[PDB]
Design a protein around this ligand. Structure first.
Ligand code: X6O
Ligand code: X6O
Lengths: 306, 306
């Protein structure tokens, strides 16, 4: 029993982290096969960052201008190209620790583990959600750019996030591994703000199922609701609409507990309308929305990785 | 910016996890050099567990009775002995992935990362505190016994916890790597309960410093207090006494922020007496006590591991 925000084991990703320096800018790179992937703003000085012309800055770089270090070992750069907001450095050594991997662009609402790195070395690991407003609530200091986010399925690392920047409120923005930002952000130092965020409804419901499995059942009421009249209430409290796909995804937890999804929706409605009256659910005094249904199933069933 | 419950990168520990089976009991083992360490109750059937005589059960085991699997590879057991509540299986192969390591018995109040494992394979990683009542608030299903807890300093893994059992309330108990339990628990299936717990005061203060560093400063008042009159208030709200050692340990955060520890103690007193009035600190609606001063410094300074 027990329910914790749990990160994927990080070892397969740790083996891919390197340091990339261009001029006086150092950040983290991801070494897979014979390519190193990093944020393109490694080629900027601080000055350059108010409004860089990346294509122009890169024209003036040679291979040798990129110092790539994997612990003690310099990897010689033999080629370079830019894809969207990501720089790809071809190197003369294939990473022997390259795991089975994919690049995935995740959907808002989905979770992933971040391996926070400085100077190519890991600091720690923690689980995030891609917020509806295309930010994550991370922990990132100067030097963390190029740290990645990932999911593990069995033996396969699905990389979904590379860290680029911090927005007002201390939330974070970045790209997929093809260098396309999540959300409307650009890699320039100018005024940008996150859109107003929403609460990931399907994830709150998944977490209420986790509470039930763990024996925390006080908030269960005797009523039901329609999907329509639940969604009107959700709209008021800035909760995203629950779709039938969401209902179907919650099917395994609903079956395991014997609680119909629409009955759990009734229970949530009452929590939204009445508050928690100083009570906690799973240790928490607020409703948690950064656990997916899959996260709950994984954690409450003991799913492991190879 | 940002502040997250952050686990140590797990890769060095992942390389040490194995599966141990004796009869029909399978759990996790820790493979370091040519020794595998696991809970001694691997030698029990379910039946045996109401009141095992471990010394007697072990007398009747041969080396061959222990099946140790490291992924695909069976490791042949060539020796076995029991130390307190831990079984040590000498094997014919030294683990080539053995990191630099130590066994440490941590103090109540200190934190560590748990690598949750099933069948010798990692499921995920998360940070815990050794509670004043010698439990941890973990996430452990049947099959997780033998999962370990650890700290990383630079290149060195300090193992401090091996998982053995779950108590009422869904909290967890286990041993150091010399097989001595934390707290008064015994490895038998009988009625045991955790002592009433207390709040780790020094850790709450460390977390209030983290909030200040992150710009969440609303709870700072204009007053100070004495260590004596703070500690009277703490006693009422079931907070552990703050000692001068604790004050000295908070020195780095106090210096960095310019807020004297006794001034922060005044601010905490008011939060304890008046509540938070529906406000949050660092996203949280409750006071958090599972960050040590070192954890805050590490996270807010970007300390990394080799
Ligand atoms: C990242 O570039 C880094 O770690 N580097 C470069 C050498 C090491 C850095 C990470 C930031 C730093 C502040 C604390 N946490 C972080 O995640 N990114 C970075 O500095 C990016 C970078 C230029 C600006 N920038 C920012 O994050 C800006 N943000 C904005 O300008 C914003 F308002 F749009 F959000 C701040 C430095 C003001 C936080 C570019 C976007 C190219
Ligand atoms: C652990 O032995 C395990 O994972 N195994 C053995 C084959 C795989 C198991 C972990 C438990 C299981 C329940 C969910 N979470 C856990 O952490 N430990 C285990 O079963 C231990 C073991 C015998 C009893 N026991 C318990 O945890 C008991 N607890 C008690 O008896 C208690 F009240 F004292 F706390 C329960 C099974 C009732 C939870 C021994 C202590 C030797």
């Amino acid at each position: 029993s027990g329910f914790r925000k749990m990160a994927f084991p990080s070892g397969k990703v740790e083996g891919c982290m390197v340091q990339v320096t261009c001029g006086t800018t150092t950040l983290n790179g991801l070494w897979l096969d014979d390519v190193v992937y990093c944020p393109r703003h490694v080629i900027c000085t601080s000055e350059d960052m108010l409004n860089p012309n990346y294509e122009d800055l890169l024209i003036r770089k040679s291979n040798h201008n990129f110092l790539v270090q994997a612990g003690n070992v310099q990897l010689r750069v033999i080629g370079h190209s830019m894809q969207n907001c990501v720089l790809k450095l071809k190197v003369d050594t294939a990473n022997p620790k390259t795991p089975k991997y994919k690049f995935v662009r995740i959907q808002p609402g989905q979770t992933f583990s971040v391996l926070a790195c400085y100077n190519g070395s890991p600091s720690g690991v923690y689980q995030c959600a891609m917020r509806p407003n295309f930010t994550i609530k991370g922990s990132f200091l100067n030097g963390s750019c190029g740290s990645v986010g990932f999911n593990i399925d069995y033996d396969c690392v699905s990389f979904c996030y590379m860290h680029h920047m911090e927005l007002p409120t201390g939330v974070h923005a970045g790209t997929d591994l093809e260098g396309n930002f999540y959300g409307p952000f650009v890699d320039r130092q100018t005024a940008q703000a996150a859109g107003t965020d929403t609460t990931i409804t399907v994830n709150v419901l998944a977490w209420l199922y986790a509470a039930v499995i763990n024996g925390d059942r006080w908030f269960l009421n005797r009523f039901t609701t329609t999907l329509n009249d639940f969604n009107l209430v959700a709209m008021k409290y800035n909760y995203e609409p629950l779709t039938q796909d969401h209902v179907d995804i919650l099917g395994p937890l609903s079956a395991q507990t014997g609680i119909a999804v629409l009955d759990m929706c009734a229970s949530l409605k009452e929590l939204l309308q009445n508050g928690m009256n100083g009570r906690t659910i799973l240790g928490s005094a607020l409703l948690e929305d950064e656990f997916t249904p899959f996260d709950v199933v994984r954690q409450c069933s003991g799913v492991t990785f190879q």
